[PDB]
Amino acid sequence: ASEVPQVVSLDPTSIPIEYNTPIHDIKVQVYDIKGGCNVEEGLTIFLVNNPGKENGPVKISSKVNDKQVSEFLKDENMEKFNVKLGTSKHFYMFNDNKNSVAVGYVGCGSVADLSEADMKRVVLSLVTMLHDNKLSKLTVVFEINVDKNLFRFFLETLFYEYMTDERFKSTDEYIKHLGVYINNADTYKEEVEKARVYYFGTYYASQLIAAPSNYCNPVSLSNAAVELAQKLNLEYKILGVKELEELKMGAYLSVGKGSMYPNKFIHLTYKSKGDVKKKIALVGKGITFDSGGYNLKAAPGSMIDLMKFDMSGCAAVLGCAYCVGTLKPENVEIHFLSAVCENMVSKNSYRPGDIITASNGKTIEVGNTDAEGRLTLADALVYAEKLGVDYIVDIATLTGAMLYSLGTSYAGVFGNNEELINKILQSSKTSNEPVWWLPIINEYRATLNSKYADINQISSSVKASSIVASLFLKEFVQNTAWAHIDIAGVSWNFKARKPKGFGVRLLTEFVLND
Amino acid sequence: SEVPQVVSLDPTSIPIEYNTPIHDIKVQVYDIKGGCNVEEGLTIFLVNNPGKENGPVKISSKVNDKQVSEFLKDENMEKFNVKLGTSKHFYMFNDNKNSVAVGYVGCGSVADLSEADMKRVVLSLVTMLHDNKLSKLTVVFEINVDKNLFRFFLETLFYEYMTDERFKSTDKNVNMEYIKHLGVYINNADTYKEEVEKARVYYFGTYYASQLIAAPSNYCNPVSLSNAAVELAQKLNLEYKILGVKELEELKMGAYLSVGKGSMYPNKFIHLTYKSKGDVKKKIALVGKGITFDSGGYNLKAAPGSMIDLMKFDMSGCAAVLGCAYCVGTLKPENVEIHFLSAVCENMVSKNSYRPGDIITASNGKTIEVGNTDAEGRLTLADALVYAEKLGVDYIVDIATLTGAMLYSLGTSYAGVFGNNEELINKILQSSKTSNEPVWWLPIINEYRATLNSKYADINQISSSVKASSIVASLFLKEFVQNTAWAHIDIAGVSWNFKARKPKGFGVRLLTEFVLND
Amino acid sequence: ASEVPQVVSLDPTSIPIEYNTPIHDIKVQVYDIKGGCNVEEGLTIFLVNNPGKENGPVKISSKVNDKQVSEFLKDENMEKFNVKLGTSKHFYMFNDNKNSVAVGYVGCGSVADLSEADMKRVVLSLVTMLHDNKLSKLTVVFEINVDKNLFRFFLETLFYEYMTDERFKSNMEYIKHLGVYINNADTYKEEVEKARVYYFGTYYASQLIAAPSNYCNPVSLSNAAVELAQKLNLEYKILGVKELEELKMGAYLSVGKGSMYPNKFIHLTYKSKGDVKKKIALVGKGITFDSGGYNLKAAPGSMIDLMKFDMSGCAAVLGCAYCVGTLKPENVEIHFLSAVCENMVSKNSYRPGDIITASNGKTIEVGNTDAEGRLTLADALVYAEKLGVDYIVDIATLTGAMLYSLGTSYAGVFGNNEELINKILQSSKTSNEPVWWLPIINEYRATLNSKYADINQISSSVKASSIVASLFLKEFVQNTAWAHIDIAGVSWNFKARKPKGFGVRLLTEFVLND
Ligand SMILES: [Zn+2]
Ligand SMILES: [Zn+2]
Ligand SMILES: [Zn+2]
């Protein structure tokens, strides 16, 4: 940890982090639906669908251990309501002990197998029932089929969407118990604490992303990474400017020349206690603010105000270290890397046209100072490869063109090894964080031929930027299976005006499945 | 106090002319009933024809000279008309056989002249003084004007006549001489005599504001401007205090300090005070926006129409306040205590600048999410308004070149006024009427307040959905006044005279009248 | 009826209009709150506040005539909920007779004086419940204070927002009963059928606006006006191209030159049965599609896809004819005028630079074909002044600058007569359609001095376009009190994606109170 420089004494010197969240105090109990449902304090919600009958009637199938409640929920009363996805209703009644109880349902539609996006919709409806109601307990009854992974996803999403970030509130009551009734409850029980770990990894990444760039700068972000490593007993090394110069990391150093915050390179290590059978490097893009540099983000739709989110890759990688440090997988050694800097406008900034030398000796002609993420990634990839790992996976908010290709719902994966790419797709399936494979088109490579330097940073002819940037990055991996995840489109949730913490669960499923 | 320089040729003060040639003009008001002596220089009749649009010129005064009277006969004048702003020059020999210049300016056919009408009349008169060498001008009012409008006539004649040559070097105007005497003939002269020296004080407050606004950003920076304010206070015997960065850190003025983080000039907060001898009945804070240059910061002013070359003028609010301090310090009103406040800084691009997305904390403890670094004026004004309210004052009035949207609502002639108290608003509209500086009341629409809701901070600096940005800025400002009558004058559209390529010094007379009226 | 031209046989030949709406089937009853509440049937909603306590607990005071619901409404239950403006909850339960009811509340925040905008939010939250409700009755309990006009505004807004427009389409049932409990119920009763009339005026204007330009064109619009006039027994005349040529309406006819639809000038008249003491012309801008013409709407932000709404003023004037023809004021004669045409790109369109002659003989130099609204209004105003009326009021979606001056909530009013402006502002207050007085600054008039014509259509220097447009219109009224209402910013509800029908209630209040 290093001292964070300040312009004025009011400049903050750390990122505030909440570790002990109210989600962590919630006691979760899972019961088997075969024993019937007890219905007492709090709110009890049934998840009901009607397969094949679009907006069909509600029917409650589980046994309920209360005669008054069973009478309320009989088919004759419930058929006046429907299962349209996301629809919900609240019921109030007195039970067999003459106590008042709150019951309800959320509609899960008429398709038997819910997609990740469907389930999020169900969760959002459920969370509007928790907001503005002081409840001590929620009980959820699954009258719908879900596999183990989708059940976990239900929990993670619930926790994440319910949790509210109030770190930056100044002048401006969570349940204590969650009951779940499900068929074959004993097989779903194992997902509960995994879900709690996954929730905090994602929420932790989200806290880092959402923290503005005066709070979250290269020095305070690397200090947060140190403090994480100390709580988790990971090994850690933060490389500063003198060390970076010695390693000849001139692509990464040039991007950070115009910042008042010194570059800091984050290297965290998890090692398994047993024989190591696989070595992995996870590389996240870490630009704490992206002004564009002398290629300033001034054009309509450039969104300079969103640019604190340009370290979302480093955040996903640190959220992954949290989950890995907590779950403790065997047989694996994982390095978590991020070349952290800030891209600013200064007398000291690198310029359009500058020629700079990366730590593998390749000279690069800078065509646009706003394509800085690929320069910092190029030195981090060289460093990752020198570690002698089996796989290198990077994750980055790299290109705006992602919005035009896959949009805000799916991230793109590119890579040089099909087996690795399949493992990432497999991890997408089991994490329920959607990614789609996109090609590295070798025909475009000639457009990176520089008249003067070994290579151009950008294409002056090809508009397919996310592909061009993957071609550039590929030049910095000589002999290792490598994949690149571009999360520029999926990282920020525009509708809810907050980060998704996207990638933490995807990467962690990758490591654990391996 | 010491102004930092990058090279030794960078200026270390704003040049300021105090004893201007207007101050050397001897002015005498004479009653028209005695008739006009016509003996030297230029004599101009202000003449109308009520009813008859572009009607003929007919002189109504007695003139105590046979020759000049002969020249001014109706038959001779009938070739000429009274269309607003039209003028003519005559040359003749009086009874003492000395050459004499005589003339008229047309004042139209509507016997009640607006502020804009009287401005056209003065402009034509000033064209008659330019490119001529004259020792004496006399003006004969053959029109009806109230006391305020007669004073406006003199203030405007003085301001428009005065030429600002501080930054000329090889191109100083060789042929520029000023009159030494001004005679005015008018009905019931004794009653207008009091307006002469008041006009002279109002002219200078206004010209002084103009000098600071016109001074480029390399002459007028936060250190040199706060230094000029100290000098002004010292000449007037006002109490004064300039708060520096260490004091502003202790006061926790985080919104104001974030704006100046990227500047080579330390933030300086100006606080001057005028206090009447005897009973203080009203305490007022006047707060002026004092951004000495506004580049936009990282939301740089790069879009077509953004006029970054005009942005030395973004301290026009602070100039108005300082010109007001001049008039107040000179005229010495009773029963008031006036605080003249400006949070002065410069909005620049640097490794040190604040960024879009940053969350900063104001001196009242409110956290603010920056959505655009070029909305910097309301961040500075938020901390200045907290400071003003902690002074225990009865009224807070701020004046500011805040939003370019003023050009689309009121344009270049009228300023907009917003506020939280209808009595205060009405006092401002009243002073608008007696100062002849036009203002229009605009609404603070509370339905837009929800668009300032921030997901992370207590409040957003800017709306992402509402385009009525002068209204949104006022709703933002209103959050920094808890329980005091407050009004806000947006002068972004009126401050610069685009036609004449100079400042208006808008606001000095409006604020003084407001103070003196109280 | 004129025949509607068609390019293909599938082109529509009329505007579909619903006259008998489900709102017209609602039986409304108003009871005094001091008597306590009958809650035995249907959905009951309490409007509740907590003055001084930001986000304070809900507390319901009314005595209710049901033991189950009474239990539900006890303080210990309701304090789980808060009063933040627009927040709502509602619960299904069984009443003392084991019939299904539902009960809830809508939060009215912590300030006793509700504004109109505040009241819209309350209504929207109530409407959200209604759009999921199939109980046959709604009871609204006012545990808050509102004046007569605000209560009528509550009803108008409830009816307007509840009603949904399904004319172009190929969960709920509309209620049949509405009960209101409010203090001084006897005085509020006279507001009910006035609200229902104002609601339909506003909805009918809305149906015209929302109808796309292939349904709603100069011929189909003026046909609709004739059918309206017939149903209300108003006098009517539609002026066609040959009559408009005889009348020398050169400015209006030039704007419509490029359209396939002939210009149609609408003139309806209501005349009171008694002595006529005031004569009024209401003139509405009626461009059924504004492409901009050769000055095409191609710049970012020009919103060409919204430009079916450029007949909003005409629609307001026609909604007002409905209300006036229904309510039948005494002592007045009202002329409802619109110069209807469509502004298109064609070999036949007028061009930037054309000099055109208005029906008062003034020659006009066209500087921009997208400032067509004021050309059509110039001839309409001349037409109106020849009728010999006491007051002319025009209403028009005239300048996009309105979004930069007053925004989307308040319209601007400009005029040549202080007393008429005062009556408009007073009607704004009583109709709850907000307007703000803006000046006609005479110093800008010189910017309309054309080198070649009598006058310019636009300024080439002044950016205050709403004022400049008003200066231009003012040249076409010689000696009559006139006011101009610019509703460009307030006519379309961008968040709800539908028209407001703005101006119907303001116009009616103006005519009813004069
Ligand atoms: Zn970037
Ligand atoms: Zn500014
Ligand atoms: Zn139009």
Closest Cα in chain A to B373: A305
**B283 Cβ contact list (under 8 Å, min separation 6):** B336, B337, B338, B339, B391, B392, B393, B394, B395
Closest Cα in chain B to C404: B468
Listed residue (C411, C442, C508) closest to C198, CA to CA = C508
**A293 Cβ contact list (under 8 Å, min separation 6):** A255, A258, A343, A344, A345, A349, A350, A369, A370, A372
Listed residue (C433, C13, C377, C4) closest to C205, CA to CA = C433
Q: Do the domain assignments include residue C13? A: no
**A1 Cβ contact list (under 8 Å, min separation 6):** A222, A223, A226, A227, A238
Neighboring chains of A (3 or more beta-carbon pairs < 8 A)? B, C
Active site residue C297: yes
Range of the domain at C384: 213-514
Listed residue (B397, B357, B390, B402) closest to B258, CA to CA = B357
Type of residue found at B439: V
Looking up tokens 């599938």, which residue turns up? C10
For strands C264-271 and C88-94, give the pairing: unpaired
- Whole-Å CA distances, C238 to A252, C217, C230, C266: 74, 14, 13, 5
Tokens linked to C140: 């609204």
Q: Do the domain assignments include residue A196? A: yes
Tokens linked to B251: 């006061």
Answer whether C93 sits within 8 Å of A92, measured CB to CB.
Answer: yes
Which residues surround the ion ligand 2 when the cut-off is CB under 5 Å? Answer: B 294, 314, 377
Backbone torsions φ then ψ of C101, nearest 5 degrees: -125, 170
Q: What is the CATH number of the domain that holds C405?
A: 3.40.630.10
Type of residue found at B99: S
Q: Is C354 annotated as a binding residue?
A: no
Residues B11-46: b if buried by 16+ CB within 10 A, e if exposed = eeebeeeeebbbeebebebbebeeebbbbbbbbbbb
Listed residue (C431, C434, C435, C443) closest to C468, CA to CA = C443
Quote the CA–CA distance of B209 and A282 in Å, as a whole number.
61
- The catalytic residue among A194, A374, A423, A500 is A374
Question: What is the separation of C-alpha B100 from the centre of its chain, rounded to a whole number of angstroms?
Answer: 37
Answer whether C404 sits within 8 Å of B442, measured CB to CB.
Answer: no
Q: Do the domain assignments include residue B108? A: yes
Name beta bridge partners: A415: A483
- The catalytic residue among B198, B378, B427, B504 is B378
Domain boundary among A163, A178, A212: A212
Q: Can you tell me whether residue B78 is helix, strand or coil?
A: coil
Q: What is the DSSP string of A415-451?
A: ES-HHHHHHHHHHHHHHT--EEE----GGGGGGG--S
Q: What is the CA radius of gyration of chain B?
A: 25
CB-CB contact of C226 with C6 (8 Å): no
Query: Which of C79, C92, C300 shows the shortest C-beta gap to A89?
Result: C92
How many residues in total does chain B contain?
Answer: 518
Contacts of B254 in chain A (CB under 8 A): 10
CB-CB contact of B468 with B405 (8 Å): yes
Is residue B137 located within the same domain as residue B253? no
Sign of CA dihedral A68, A73, A74, A78: positive
Listed residue (C248, C310, C316, C251) closest to C282, CA to CA = C316
Query: After which residues does chain A break, using C–N > 2.5 Å?
Result: 172
Residues B57-70: b if buried by 16+ CB within 10 A, e if exposed = bbbebebebebbbe
Distance from CA of B257 to the nearest CA of A (A): 8
Is residue B204 located within the same domain as residue B233? no
Using CB atoms within 10 Å of the CB of residue C25, give its burial: 0 to 12 exposed, 13 to 18 middle, 19+ buried: exposed
Domain boundary among C154, C177, C212: C212
Name beta bridge partners: B340: B272, B286
Neighboring chains of B (3 or more beta-carbon pairs < 8 A)? A, C
For strands A88-94 and A100-107, give the pairing: antiparallel
Active site residue C497: no
Query: Which of B114, B405, B448 shows the shortest C-beta gap to C404?
Result: B405
Answer whether A307 sits within 8 Å of B456, measured CB to CB.
Answer: no
Answer whether A10 sits within 8 Å of B371, measured CB to CB.
Answer: no
Q: Give the best residue of C409, C486, C492 to mutate against chain B (max B CB count within 10 A).
A: C409
Quote the CA–CA distance of A80 and A103 in Å, as a whole number.
16
Type of residue found at A471: L
For residue B196, count other CB atoms closer than 10 A to its CB.
16
Q: According to the 3-state scheme, what is the secondary structure of C358-384?
A: CCCCCEEECCCCCCCHHHHHHHHHHHH
Tokens linked to A142: 């699954």
Q: Do the domain assignments include residue B13? A: no
Sign of CA dihedral C245, C248, C252, C253: positive
Answer whether B455 sits within 8 Å of A304, measured CB to CB.
Answer: no
CB-CB contact of A40 with A95 (8 Å): yes
**Experimentally determined by:** X-ray
Helix A504-513, helix A418-431: angle, nearest 10: 120
Answer whether A90 sits within 8 Å of C90, measured CB to CB.
Answer: yes
- The total of structural domains in chain B comes to 2
Q: Give the best residue of A15, A161, A172 to mutate against chain B (max B CB count within 10 A).
A: A172
Q: What is the CA radius of gyration of chain C?
A: 25
Kindly give the distance from the C-alpha atom of residue B294 to the centroid of ligand 2, in angstroms, as a whole number.
5
Q: Can you tell me whether residue B254 is helix, strand or coil?
A: helix
What's the half-sphere exposure (Cβ side, CA atoms, 13 Å) at C216?
29
CB-CB contact of B17 with B211 (8 Å): yes
Q: Do the domain assignments include residue A14? A: no
Contacts of B411 in chain C (CB under 8 A): 441, 444, 462-464, 467
Listed residue (A10, A2, A498) closest to A225, CA to CA = A2
Name beta bridge partners: A45: A104, A140
Local structure of residue C500 (DSSP, 8 states): -
Tokens linked to C82: 């808060």
Q: Can you tell me whether residue C385 is helix, strand or coil?
A: helix
Q: According to the 3-state scheme, what is the secondary structure of B399-441?
A: EECCCCCHHHHCCCCCEEEEECCHHHHHHHHHHHHHHCCCEEE
CB-CB contact of C504 with C198 (8 Å): yes
B interface residues, C as partner, C-beta within 8 Å: 114, 116, 405, 407-414, 440, 442-443, 445-448, 466-471
Sign of CA dihedral B4, B7, B12, B17: negative
Is residue B221 located within the same domain as residue B211? no
Tokens linked to C233: 């027994």
Listed residue (C488, C407, C405) closest to B406, CA to CA = C405
Is residue C207 located within the same domain as residue C219? no
Kindly give the distance from the C-alpha atom of residue B490 to the centroid of ligand 1, in angstroms, as a whole number.
37
Of the bound ligands, which one is closest to the alpha carbon of residue C307?
3
Is residue B470 located within the same domain as residue B335? yes
Answer whether A91 sits within 8 Å of C92, measured CB to CB.
Answer: yes
Local structure of residue A245 (DSSP, 8 states): H
Name beta bridge partners: B285: B339, B396
Query: Which of A77, A92, A133 shows the shortest C-beta gap to C72?
Result: A92
Domain boundary among B216, B245, B264: B216
Is residue C236 located within the same domain as residue C274? yes
- Whole-Å CA distances, C463 to B359, B467, C373, C402: 35, 16, 18, 12
Listed residue (C69, C76, C122) closest to C96, CA to CA = C69
Q: What is the DSSP string of A113-168?
A: S--HHHHHHHHHHHHHHHTTS--SEEEEEEES---HHHHHHHHHHHHHHH----TT
Is residue B207 located within the same domain as residue B259? no
**A242 Cβ contact list (under 8 Å, min separation 6):** none
Q: Do the domain assignments include residue C11? A: no
Answer whether B356 sits within 8 Å of A304, measured CB to CB.
Answer: yes
Q: Do the domain assignments include residue A232? A: yes
Is residue B222 located within the same domain as residue B75? no
- Cα–Cα–Cα angle for C154, C156, C161, rounded to 5 degrees: 95
Is residue B139 located within the same domain as residue B224? no
Distance from CA of B243 to the nearest CA of A (A): 15
CB-CB contact of C402 with C413 (8 Å): no
This structure's resolution (Å) is: 2.0
Type of residue found at A23: I
Is residue A464 located within the same domain as residue A497? yes
Answer whether A90 sits within 8 Å of C93, measured CB to CB.
Answer: no
CB-CB contact of C254 with C375 (8 Å): yes
Q: Is C25 annotated as a binding residue?
A: no
Q: Do the domain assignments include residue C12? A: no
Is residue C65 located within the same domain as residue C170? yes
Terminal CA-to-CA distance of chain C, rounded, Å? 34
For strands A264-271 and A235-239, give the pairing: antiparallel
Is residue A96 located within the same domain as residue A112? yes
Contacts of A91 in chain C (CB under 8 A): 91-93
For residue B465, count other CB atoms closer than 10 A to its CB.
12
Neighboring chains of C (3 or more beta-carbon pairs < 8 A)? A, B
Tokens linked to A116: 């990740």
Q: What is the CATH number of the domain that holds B110?
A: 3.40.220.10
Q: Can you tell me whether residue C499 is helix, strand or coil?
A: strand
How many residues in total does chain A contain?
Answer: 514
